[PDB]
């Protein structure tokens, strides 16, 4: 129950019902993402030779998704052991760093693709619609650097922590403090949420206003950007909602017996796996949309 991490009062929980739902969903997530991302990378690197600016961003998203899917098997192994990391200390920090970095990278590149579509559809005569490959590669490297800059603190903050009779390797704990990590999670949902919603709404409004809904494939494009927004919201909403709920249960009362946390704590991590479904669904909608 109660524990102290870096002079911080936290309430970890190693309960059951975690080795029941999480490993079956994670295994199927891994075995479907492997095939989807392998086909995407095959059609990207080898079978096709044409690099356009939007395709570079799509390839970056695919790389992030593939790395996250590769990282997923270790997560499945961890949750199978009922929260017992049996790998080491360097692999644990590396795994947490990779998880955070490619989650943020997937979100950032999704936002970048949405902004690119917004510029293509609403502002067709802007410069950012005909950039060179050098500028696109520089932007990609800059975004990757921003991600690493935001996650070196996860890379450095701590190692696996002994508790009870086992060891826990986690960064999404619950503690009575508001560090940069949780605020960064809330930002990495909300700000891209606003950007994506604004871009999608403007795209829909401009396409409908300019009398373009008559065209056939444009209707498919509209429905696909709509389902992209919907799936992003569906995949990233339960996690942030449970995080806000546990924050509220933390500020009001808090640091108590902490059993009241557990009823919602199990709700958090399950929904966390739901975010990986996002990584699974992007190949279906993003790359697999050519008529």
Ligand X SMILES: CCCCCn1c(=O)[nH]c(=O)c2[nH]c(Cl)nc21
Q: How far apart are CA 227 and CA 8, in angstroms?
A: 41
Measured CA to CA in angstroms, residue 75 lies from 9, 79, 143 at distances of: 26, 6, 26
Does 78 participate in binding ligand X (rule CB under 6 A)?
A: yes
Out of 9, 167, 171, 206, the residue judged to bind ligand X by CB under 6 A: 171
Give least dist CB 212 to ligand X, A. Answer: 40
CA trace torsion 113, 119, 125, 126 (10° rounding): -80
Residue 198 tokens read as 């604004």
Does 75 participate in binding ligand X (rule CB under 6 A)?
A: yes
Does 246 participate in binding ligand X (rule CB under 6 A)?
A: no
Give least dist CB 273 to ligand X, A. Answer: 5
Which span sits near ligand X by CB under 6 A: 27-35, 109-117, 168-176, 199-207? 168-176
Print the binding letters for residues 119-158 with ligand X: x by CB under 6 A, - otherwise.
Answer: ----------------------------------------
Give least dist CB 183 to ligand X, A. Answer: 15
Does 170 participate in binding ligand X (rule CB under 6 A)?
A: yes
Q: How far apart are CA 276 and CA 28, in angstroms?
A: 11
The DSSP secondary structure of 235-266, one letter per residue, reads HHHHHHHHHHHHHHHHHSS-SSS-HHHHHHHH
In contact, 235 and 285? CB cutoff 8 Å:
no
Name the residue number minimizing CB distance to ligand X: 171
Q: How far apart are CA 40 and CA 42, in angstroms?
A: 5
In contact, 202 and 118? CB cutoff 8 Å:
yes
Does 107 participate in binding ligand X (rule CB under 6 A)?
A: no
Does 96 participate in binding ligand X (rule CB under 6 A)?
A: yes
Q: How many other CB atoms are there within 10 angstroms of residue 283's CB atom?
A: 23
Q: Is 243 buried (19+), middle (13-18) or exposed (0-12) by CB count in 10 A?
A: buried
Give least dist CB 103 to ligand X, A. Answer: 6
Q: How far apart are CA 144 and CA 55, in angstroms?
A: 16
Which span sits near ligand X by CB under 6 A: 33-41, 170-178, 225-233, 240-248? 170-178
Out of 41, 67, 95, 101, the residue judged to bind ligand X by CB under 6 A: 95
Does 174 participate in binding ligand X (rule CB under 6 A)?
A: no
Does 249 participate in binding ligand X (rule CB under 6 A)?
A: no
Does 41 participate in binding ligand X (rule CB under 6 A)?
A: no
Does 169 participate in binding ligand X (rule CB under 6 A)?
A: yes
Number of residues that bind ligand X (CB under 6 A): 12
Q: What stretches of 71-226 adopt beta strand conformation (E)?
A: 161-163, 166-168
Does 196 participate in binding ligand X (rule CB under 6 A)?
A: no
Does 242 participate in binding ligand X (rule CB under 6 A)?
A: no
Residue 66 tokens read as 């593939």
In contact, 139 and 60? CB cutoff 8 Å:
no
Does 272 participate in binding ligand X (rule CB under 6 A)?
A: yes
Q: Which is nearer to ligand X, 108 or 136 (CB)?
A: 108
- DSSP letter assigned to residue 167: E
User: What is the contact surface with ligand X in residues (CB under 6 A)?
Assistant: 75, 78, 95-96, 99-100, 169-172, 272-273
């Amino acid at each position: 129950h109660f524990l102290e991490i870096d002079k911080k009062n936290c309430c970890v929980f190693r309960d059951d019902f975690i080795v029941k739902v999480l490993p079956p969903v994670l295994g199927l997530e891994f075995i479907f993402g492997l095939l989807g991302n392998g086909l995407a990378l095959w059609i990207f690197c080898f079978h096709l030779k044409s690099w356009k600016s939007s395709r570079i961003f799509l390839f970056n998203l695919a790389v992030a998704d593939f790395l996250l899917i590769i990282c997923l098997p270790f997560l499945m192994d961890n949750y199978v052991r009922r929260w017992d990391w049996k790998f080491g200390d360097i692999p644990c920090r590396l795994m947490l760093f990779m998880l955070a970095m490619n989650r943020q990278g997937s979100i950032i590149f999704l936002t970048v693709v949405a902004v690119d579509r917004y510029f293509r559809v609403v502002h067709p005569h802007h410069a950012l619609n005909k950039i060179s490959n050098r500028t696109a590669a520089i932007i990609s490297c800059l975004l990757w650097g921003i991600t690493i800059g935001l996650t070196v603190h996860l890379l450095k903050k701590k190692m696996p922590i002994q508790n009870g009779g086992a060891n826990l390797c986690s960064s999404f704990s619950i503690c009575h403090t508001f560090q940069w990590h949780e605020a960064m999670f809330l930002l990495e949902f909300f700000l891209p949420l606003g950007i994506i919603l604004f871009c999608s709404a403007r795209i829909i409004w401009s396409l409908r206003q300019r009398q373009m809904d008559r065209h056939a494939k444009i209707k498919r494009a509209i429905t696909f950007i709509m389902v992209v927004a919907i799936v992003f919201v569906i995949c990233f909403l339960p996690s942030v909602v449970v995080r806000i709920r546990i924050f509220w249960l933390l500020h009001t009362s808090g640091t108590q017996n902490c059993e009241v946390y557990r009823s919602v704590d199990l709700a958090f991590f399950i929904t966390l796996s739901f975010t990986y479904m996002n990584s699974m669904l992007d190949p279906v909608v993003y790359y697999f949309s050519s008529p």
